[PDB]
Design a protein around this ligand. Structure first.
Ligand SMILES: CC(=O)N[C@H]1CNc2ccccc2C1
Length: 152
């Protein structure tokens, strides 16, 4: 049948919210109050892929926009991009591998590993107003843990 999707927001474990940074980038910043309306709402789709109790393959589309987070090689490195799709063939159950993240639940937090690039994670910087990126370790100064908030 159809693919199943949930609307949600994400915050990093330092409780930074995600906002648009021009058309094809996200950035993370500390937000509260009125400015919370700026945060990106995701449509998280539950897609085809290798699955276990704590590791669930998802696509992170933007709610009612034909824009997906995707993992591609850029200037020879795994990078995070926002990619446009045909709003007539998405969202689907069999999403292409560049769009798939393994949503991993460890110690009441979420990590989003690239299915295409093992051990590369959706990441934020500690500094305010810096891009969301794909980082090649769930260790060090960069932040790889998130919480999800469910949206109506
Ligand atoms: C123009 C703009 O920055 N809008 C925000 C708020 N709402 C929203 C909803 C879905 C996906 C992204 C967004 C970002």
């Amino acid at each position: 049948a159809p693919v199943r999707s949930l609307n949600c927001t994400l915050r990093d474990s330092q409780q930074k919210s995600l906002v648009m940074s021009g058309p094809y980038e996200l950035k993370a910043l500390h937000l509260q109050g009125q400015d919370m309306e700026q945060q990106v709402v995701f449509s998280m789709s539950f897609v085809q892929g290798e699955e276990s109790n704590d590791k669930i393959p998802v696509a992170l589309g933007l709610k009612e926009k034909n824009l997906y987070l995707s993992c591609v090689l850029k200037d020879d490195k795994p990078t995070l991009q926002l990619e446009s799709v045909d709003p007539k063939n998405y969202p689907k159950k069999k999403m292409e591998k560049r769009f798939v993240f393994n949503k991993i639940e460890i110690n009441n937090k979420l990590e989003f590993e690239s299915a295409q690039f093992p051990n590369w994670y959706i990441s934020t910087s500690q500094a305010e107003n810096m891009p969301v990126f794909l980082g090649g370790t769930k260790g060090g100064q960069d932040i790889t843990d998130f919480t999800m908030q469910f949206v109506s």
